[PDB]
Amino acid sequence: ECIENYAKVNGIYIYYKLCKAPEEKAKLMTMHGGPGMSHDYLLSLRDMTKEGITVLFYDQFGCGRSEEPDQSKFTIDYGVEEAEALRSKLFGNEKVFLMGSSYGGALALAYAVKYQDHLKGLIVSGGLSSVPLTVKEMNRLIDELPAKYRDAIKKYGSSGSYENPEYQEAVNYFYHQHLLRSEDWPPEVLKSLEYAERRNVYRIMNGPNQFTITGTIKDWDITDKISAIKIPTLITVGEYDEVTPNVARVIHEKIAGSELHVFRDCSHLTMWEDREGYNKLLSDFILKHL
Ligand SMILES: N[C@@H](Cc1ccccc1)C(=O)O
Numbered sequence: 001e002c003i004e005n006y007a008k009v010n011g012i013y014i015y016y017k018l019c020k021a022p023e024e025k026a027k028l029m030t031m032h033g034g035p036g037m038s039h040d041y042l043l044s045l046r047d048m049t050k051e052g053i054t055v056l057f058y059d060q061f062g063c064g065r066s067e068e069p070d071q072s073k074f075t076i077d078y079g080v081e082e083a084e085a086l087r088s089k090l091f092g093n094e095k096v097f098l099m100g101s102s103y104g105g106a107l108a109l110a111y112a113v114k115y116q117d118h119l120k121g122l123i124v125s126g127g128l129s130s131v132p133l134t135v136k137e138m139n140r141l142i143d144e145l146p147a148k149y150r151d152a153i154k155k156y157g158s159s160g161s162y163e164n165p166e167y168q169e170a171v172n173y174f175y176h177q178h179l180l181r182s183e184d185w186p187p188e189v190l191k192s193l194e195y196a197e198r199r200n201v202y203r204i205m206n207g208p209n210q211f212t213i214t215g216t217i218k219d220w221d222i223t224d225k226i227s228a229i230k231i232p233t234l235i236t237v238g239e240y241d242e243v244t245p246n247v248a249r250v251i252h253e254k255i256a257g258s259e260l261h262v263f264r265d266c267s268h269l270t271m272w273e274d275r276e277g278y279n280k281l282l283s284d285f286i287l288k289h290l
Helices: 039-052 075-093 105-119 132-146 147-156 163-180 187-195 202-205 245-254 275-287
Strands: 003-005 013-019 026-031 053-059 096-101 119-125 233-238 259-263
Touching: 013 039, 013 075, 026 039, 026 105, 026 275, 039 096, 039 187, 039 275, 053 075, 053 275, 075 096, 075 187, 075 202, 096 105, 105 119, 105 147, 119 275, 132 163, 132 245, 147 202, 163 275, 187 275, 233 245, 233 275, 245 259, 259 275
Parallel strands: 026 053, 026 096, 096 119, 119 233, 233 259
Antiparallel strands: 003 013, 013 053
């Protein structure tokens, strides 16, 4: 199994899980989405160890098993230093690959913008360089939703009545349409969702739900900066991704040399909807840039 540990990182105790590859060829660091989720829903990327790729999972500040730091530290810039601190505290001066999903991708970009010198490659799956853009795009998704659920999200949404069952059905439908297109959501995914609903980070940095981004990052946007990323970048996105491929396009358009792969018939959690295709894509990318 993977080697887990609860070591002090950048001041606070963080939880990380290192899964070493039998014949290691590259170290891949992962950043879960949210803010407030956990590494749990990214475990599917573990398969890559079978491809000589060591994968490092870890719960960010206030997430999963890691401890919650002062609320003044609930920032993307903070997560970056946390990541760097973890990357050096575990691998030292070794250049690794960084992957980020959803908010984790945005975080991955932020990190890459400052610490790309420590990276051999950047992977952004369903990530974003601008929240407003992401919001401008999710609103469109809600409008394209069958009125039944659209009116509900818009009705109880303005009254902050997220507890209402009618609003729930809509949030459920939307999720099964742009978050994970499948009947049986895997435990790992439900665990990460459960975690975000039990900790504070999600409520403070993101907001009520997946498309109600009213938290402290509602205005985050580093699009006019990501252009500085010169390292090999692989940007993926699902056809029906809640963080639309158009949002991915913006990242691709800036990062020169970057690749943009849209997973057809996939949504946000493409690592589960197409675990084999998704993993093969990432592993092939990494190995081609050792
Ligand atoms: N909270 C969702 C989508 C999202 C991420 C980041 C910002 C806004 C929305 C996720 O990470 O799966």
